[PDB]
Design an enzyme around this catalytic site. Structure first.
Site, PDB file in Angstrom:
ATOM      1  CE1 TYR A 169      45.299  42.589  43.867  1.00 36.54           C
ATOM      2  CE2 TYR A 169      43.028  41.381  44.057  1.00 36.54           C
ATOM      3  CZ  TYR A 169      43.976  41.880  43.191  1.00 36.54           C
ATOM      4  OH  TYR A 169      44.216  41.912  41.746  1.00 36.54           O
TER       5      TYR A 169
ATOM      6  CD  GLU B 251      49.621  35.054  44.792  1.00 37.52           C
ATOM      7  OE1 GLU B 251      49.881  34.266  45.895  1.00 37.52           O
ATOM      8  OE2 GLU B 251      50.190  35.122  43.803  1.00 37.52           O
TER       9      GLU B 251
ATOM     10  CE1 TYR C  14      48.578  41.991  44.956  1.00 34.75           C
ATOM     11  CE2 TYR C  14      49.378  44.074  44.287  1.00 34.75           C
ATOM     12  CZ  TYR C  14      49.025  42.715  44.057  1.00 34.75           C
ATOM     13  OH  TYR C  14      48.949  42.049  42.957  1.00 34.75           O
TER      14      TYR C  14
ATOM     15  CG  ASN D 261      48.480  33.960  39.754  1.00 34.97           C
ATOM     16  OD1 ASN D 261      48.572  34.193  40.958  1.00 34.97           O
ATOM     17  ND2 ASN D 261      48.559  34.851  39.011  1.00 34.97           N
TER      18      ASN D 261
ATOM     19  CD  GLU E 150      47.327  43.684  40.878  1.00 34.53           C
ATOM     20  OE1 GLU E 150      48.508  43.912  40.318  1.00 34.53           O
ATOM     21  OE2 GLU E 150      46.637  42.907  40.767  1.00 34.53           O
TER      22      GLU E 150
END
Length: 189
Positions: free
Chosen positions: A76, A176, A87, A43, A85
């Site tokens: 982001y 990502e 997006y 990740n 957080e």
């Protein structure tokens, strides 16, 4: 080509993070450009933008995005008090990042409808260490790897749905990847 971390390059803030798995090569280029090439990575999240972001920024991006598996391209960022957080997903690969999330509404912005969701991360890594916090998502139905994002359209739509944001921390256009391979070159402005 740099190792995981944060800093400033050519007038832009950048953040590159990974879970310890190799296979990722992140490179900062001229101006707001950055490129990432990954082969069977774990990740990771990397990109360029601003520190701090704002609630009315119009973000421009353009480039090539070729994911081979789980991956996504988007605006982001984070806010604090509340810790959020968020997006604004412009494109993604094999996995829709909002999978299993709770849909709260929709918003039409910059040429496409976006589905809005809220999810909760429990005891997960964050800009302030291990924590439990909410994630806000705007997922574009019509995928693209170039265009303009009026962040205010999303933040206001989220607020209308009861999803409030705190004081902004960083705000970037990031690529990502999650246990996949791929390549991307993006220029932010």
């Amino acid at each position: 080509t740099i190792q995981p971390g944060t800093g400033y390059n050519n007038g832009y803030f950048y953040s590159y993070w990974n879970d310890g798995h190799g296979g990722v090569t992140y490179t900062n280029g001229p101006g707001g450009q950055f490129s990432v090439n990954w082969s069977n990575s774990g990740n990771f999240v990397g990109g360029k933008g601003w520190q701090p972001g704002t609630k009315n920024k119009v973000i421009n991006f353009s480039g090539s995005y070729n994911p081979n598996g789980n991956s996504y391209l988007s605006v982001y960022g984070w806010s604090r008090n509340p810790l959020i957080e968020y997006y604004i997903v412009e494109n993604f690969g094999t996995y829709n990042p909002s999978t299993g999330a709770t849909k709260l509404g929709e918003v039409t912005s910059d040429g496409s409808v976006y589905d809005i969701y809220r999810t909760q991360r429990v005891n997960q890594p964050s800009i302030i260490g291990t924590a439990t916090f909410y994630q806000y998502w705007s997922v574009r139905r019509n995928h693209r790897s170039s265009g303009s994002v009026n962040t205010a359209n999303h933040f206001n739509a989220w607020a209308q749905q009861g999803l409030t944001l705190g004081t902004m921390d960083y705000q970037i256009v990031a690529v990502e990847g999650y246990f996949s391979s791929g390549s991307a070159s993006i220029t932010v402005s």
